[PDB]
Symmetry: C3
Subunit: 399 residues, 3 copies
């Protein structure tokens, strides 16, 4: 009961339109049957749509408008399309992503493979997307452009208690987008080789983003949060080549702890447009130069004075972080300049303590811009590894 | 084999008693069939009971006495009954929780929907409860009382290697209770709008409580631990209105790290009755005033001198935490008093280092009561933001 | 489609060779059918093999050579064979592990129950092993030897995006082995009473090991990592009696944060053969004496001067950790010696800050060996709890 398998369900008016030819059409007809049956606001349990191991083409955008809908598969089936596209496929035993593999072949007018939204009142709640694969197939015009106008899963209406786990997102301009998230959970996923990985837009409350593997694109964000409060980002392994790896705009009282960050460009961790009272601690922050040839020479338009960690806001605590910076003197922007590990762009009362910096070149561990006030820097470098353009900055040298 | 679907299984002596009318009765008959079949202590693999998407009434308490029993569903189906009860339902498209929805309608004599217990020897092991929803339906006498005498899942006998994940608990006086837990795992769950969320009573060892979303009641605990050793509490997003958010009584060598805590009352983090050698670090602790009108004016009977974090024990390390305190001067208890972020009630050798406090009012970041001995306060406030009633306290100003 | 249940699938040439008698033979025939069917490198989605609740004997080693293969069960079914073997079984209601229980009865020539490997090009990707039980049955010659020459799951070829979750490993000389892991995920598992738990050999990239419960053997490792980069180890509860609990050899830029460590021997956390730029923070490290009689008197051949935490490498940051050391003066190796909490064996620029030590005996919180250069020790003990055999060590007393 209330359980469907995409491969056994026939579309009565269109019998040869299967999960293989258009799983999008198939899922929309299933959701139509769910609404068919559950007409009572007091009797709308939802349902589970299972996606068997296989290759499925999605031409028709799926509109999800039922609460507690679960779309699950048996695997994330990730496969590096990036390496395939930059390698010689001769004799290769695999040329594509697997598991419950959905190839997103959406039209411009309906970008998203899945678009969750509903009008009227109760906000959508309890929707779960798990253990299946969303593949954008390829990048266009350039094979390494990270552009293709497709989106995997997008939640456009305010949502409560959503759960996104065990997923596999690959080669999508936008993997996952969730606006107005509340008690959202994005954990144990593989989101990579996507222009953008996770975008929490609009605003948010007590959301959790942990245990995930992320890799974005030069012109995209890996993890982005807009006007969020209570966001916990922990135990994620964010690797190369978003424009940033963690980017908060105007979020307050959030926490970024126990994470692994690896970027090839300036501003891997950004706190923009007045982020207040956030905790950034116990994170490994490694900045280095792009190591995979196909992408050598690409950038995010930022120079090394932007800082690996960029803070614009008040009362944020950046501590107990390990900075490993290895970048060719010649790749350092501007010529002659000392790389900035932590830049306090503006704001009041920011505190920077116990941050170990390791770098191949002379670097300013912490820089407090002339706009900053009442900042505090403790055990984050010697006096000559710290530049304070403010005169009310309190500094304590690492002995 | 050894797999049942609650909707297809008929109770031989009682044919019209279905999962819909009494899933409790159904599950008990299934467990009876399991014991029927597995009579050999050397041949007792257990089984899996699947709960299809749907609305199910539970009148009869389920007694779980077989090891390695797995009761799974397809979703946590959380839905804010609290907001429904305090809003105008007209035209609402949903009035109830979904997914594998079990409405707990238990009788006083058998409170618990699920009661796991067994006599004799081997302790019960490997029991798994996952991906389904337990809903207490409503609160009684007051719709906002958080009282109703029902319990979701309770483990009364010593257990080994239990696993509780992907669940949905809502409107239950007691969501989850586990006595004598050993190598227990409570992760990736949504437990909210419950009088009490997770109660680890009796005693415990090497337990993990992480990646969970929890919100309790004024007269209840969010996460409670009794005489636990090796407890790890990490990556949880604990929000509003337990009497406390984390409460340990006599636990030793446990760890509370990388969490998001948000409370509306004093003592959000409590270490009572001599807790020794525990690590409380890298947590975001925010205390503020109740923000949802229906509950404005409710309390936990504690004043602001109890401290947001209350410690009674020895050698505990409270460090690298960010305290965000925003409370109306007029709501501050006692009139004229300065709020206490960290109170070291009693104990020896407690260490408080690198704790950033942000508050709208003059506040004592750390207070060491006259009973305390050999305490140490480092980089947690200026000398005037610290009150030591002891004389062996070692203090170092945040420059 | 592409979904098999091990109990319904007959081996055409060998009809009575069931999952019960040789699930190994069964799975190999299933994989043979998958390869039968998916001959196109462009059409190799993989499949899912489901293992129903039950007792299954594995005599034949399973060779997994298809990408995106998912082998899943309904439970980890852990059961302490150690306690059974050292107790009186009379009247016991369980004598063995449950859930989707696979008893590994492999022959010397094919140790591993599951051996994942493939020749040629694309590296194997997206393979998932979840929610089932691997039991080695017993230890041989000694019942408490932790030796039996069996291995549970071993990945010998370079792999990408593997996922190992919800598993149960018990009584195996080697539970899990994964060479050349990339974006690997080992989370939410129960690996205990195994000679060795998790072995990441060869080399690795951006791997995550979190939310796991581990206990190894005196002659084995709990978590081992070889030449790994970007390894994140977080939220794990590692308990008693590996020779070590976390052991890295030549890993760089990895992070071990927010973990619970409990050992009975020296060197619970080891950074060997030049590990550079690693973050070890926010961990609870408890060293004490073996508490279960059957194992009293056993050891790992290391003395108390090796240190509970042993570091040999450069620029590592060991901070915000809580050390609880309780060991009988008489069990302390060498007689008369002061236990070493943190030993910096050799290396340049290591930083040790904010580490709280609690011990029943006079102990050297930090020892910097004469080989070390430019080390830093802050707030990790008084000058007399710190031994620096170097002269360029910068030290700052815990006031
Ligand atoms: O930088 C990681 C980035 O590159 C990809 C290839 O486009 O992975 C390639 C690889 O070699 O990079 C890391 C190594 O540093 C390793 O894990 C990879 O397997 C890509 O998907 C990533 O986004
Ligand atoms: O304080 C959280 C508490 O209130 C509930 C309503 O009873 O959620 C309401 C809500 O508005 O509170 C938070 C914002 O502060 C937000 O996530 C909610 O959606 C409830 O379940 C919580 O226990
Ligand atoms: O030290 C843990 C070790 O011992 C076992 C028994 O061989 O567990 C026994 C037990 O008593 O140890 C811890 C307590 O200290 C507790 O969780 C156990 O249940 C074993 O599996 C462990 O590896």
């Amino acid at each position: 009961p209330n359980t469907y398998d995409v491969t056994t369900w026939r579309i009565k008016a269109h019998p040869e339109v299967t999960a293989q030819s258009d799983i999008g059409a198939v899922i929309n007809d299933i959701i139509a049957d769910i609404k068919q049956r559950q007409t009572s606001p007091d009797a709308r349990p939802g349902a589970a749509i299972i996606i068997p191991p296989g290759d499925y083409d999605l031409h028709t955008q799926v509109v999800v408008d039922v609460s507690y809908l679960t779309i699950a598969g048996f695997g994330h089936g990730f496969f590096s399309r990036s390496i395939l596209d930059n390698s010689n496929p001769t004799g290769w035993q695999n040329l594509q992503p697997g598991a419950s593999h959905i190839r997103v072949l959406t039209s411009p007018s309906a970008p998203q493979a899945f678009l969750v939204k509903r009008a009227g009142d109760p906000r959508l709640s309890g929707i779960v997307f798990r253990d299946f694969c969303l593949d954008g197939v390829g990048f266009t015009p350039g094979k390494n452009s990270y552009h293709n106008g497709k989106t995997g899963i997008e939640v456009a209406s305010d949502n409560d208690s959503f759960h996104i786990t065990g997923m596999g997102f690959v080669y999508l301009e936008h993997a996952l987008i969730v606006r107005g998230a509340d008690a959202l959970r994005v954990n144990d996923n593989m989101i990579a080789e996507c222009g953008n990985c996770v975008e929490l837009t609009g605003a948010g409350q007590a959301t959790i983003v942990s245990g995930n593997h992320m890799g974005a694109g030069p012109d995209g964000v890996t993890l982005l949060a807009e006007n969020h409060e209570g966001l916990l980002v922990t135990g994620n392994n964010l690797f190369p080549r978003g424009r940033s790896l963690i980017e908060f705009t105007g979020c307050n009282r959030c926490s970024v702890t126990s994470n692994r960050l690896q970027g090839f460009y300036p501003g891997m961790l950004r706190l923009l447009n007045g982020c207040k009272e956030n905790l950034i601690t116990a994170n490994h922050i490694r900045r280095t130069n792009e190591g995979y040839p196909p992408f050598i020479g690409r950038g995010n338009g930022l120079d090394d004075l932007y800082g690996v960690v960029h803070i614009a806001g008040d009362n944020n605590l950046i501590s107990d972080n390990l900075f490993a910076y290895n970048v060719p003197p010649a790749n350092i922007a501007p010529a002659g300049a000392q790389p900035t590990q932590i830049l306090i762009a503006g704001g009041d009362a920011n505190v920077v303590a116990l941050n170990h910096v390791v770098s191949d070149v002379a670097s300013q561990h912490v820089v407090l811009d002339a706009s900053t006030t009442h900042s505090k820097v403790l055990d984050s470098g010697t006096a000559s590894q710290i530049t304070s353009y403010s005169s009310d900055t309190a500094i304590r040298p690492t002995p």
